[PDB]
Design a protein around this ligand. Structure first.
Ligand SMILES: CC(=O)N[C@@H]1[C@@H](O)[C@H](O)[C@@H](CO)O[C@H]1O
Ligand SMILES: CC(=O)N[C@@H]1[C@@H](O)[C@H](O)[C@@H](CO)O[C@H]1O
Length: 178
């Protein structure tokens, strides 16, 4: 069996956080080293039991404005982009996102004759896109995409909520250019 125990709408990163970085103007696109700080994580989004098998698919709705090392650079503003990862609970298990389609972000696992849970995580990193002198960039609260649980091996979601959404909290980038 499966049931939904998380939240439908989830914020990514601290609200109106400020991030500073320094980069050479010739080093673009530039990814801010924010670690897993601009993210969301919850080990308990679905409760599963009795042989239920489940994985996760992720979808980013932001426009693809570029590509970096095999993953999409999603657009926020003309000057700021975003790299995105979605996956199982541990941030380290995040899957690099590309495109705007539902992608497998967690191969899945099957619970046995007991009850457990299925979680998820999302983290992103800001990207400076255009050459410019030192400047401050502001990013508005913006919807990013979603993550859906995906039953397999004959398991079924039935009427259970399968999808949750993620909204990027506003932030400011204090960009120093050398
Ligand atoms: C409470 C807890 O840790 N539950 C985790 C869940 O978050 C994760 O999605 C799943 C698959 O790795 O393993 C469970 O044990
Ligand atoms: C278009 C679409 O829904 N893509 C799904 C993908 O999410 C899923 O991970 C994969 C196998 O699990 O099967 C594809 O059909």
């Amino acid at each position: 069996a499966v049931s939904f125990i998380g939240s439908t709408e989830n914020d990514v990163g601290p609200s109106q956080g400020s991030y500073s970085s320094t980069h050479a103007m010739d080093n673009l696109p530039f990814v801010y080293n924010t670690g897993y700080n601009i993210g969301y994580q919850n080990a308990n989004v679905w409760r599963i039991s009795g042989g239920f098998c489940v994985g996760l698919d992720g979808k980013v709705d932001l426009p693809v404005v570029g590509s970096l090392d095999g993953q999409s650079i999603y657009g926020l503003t003309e000057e700021v982009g975003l790299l995105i990862w979605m996956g199982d609970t541990n941030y380290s298990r995040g899957t690099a996102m590309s495109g705007n389609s539902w992608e497998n972000v967690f191969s899945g696992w099957c619970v046995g004759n007991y009850v457990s849970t299925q979680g998820l995580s999302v983290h992103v990193r800001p990207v400076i896109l255009k050459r410019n002198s030192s400047a401050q960039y502001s990013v508005q609260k913006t919807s990013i995409g979603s993550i859906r649980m995906r039953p397999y091996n004959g398991s079924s979601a039935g009427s259970v909520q399968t999808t949750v959404n993620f909204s990027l909290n506003p932030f400011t980038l204090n960009d120093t250019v050398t």
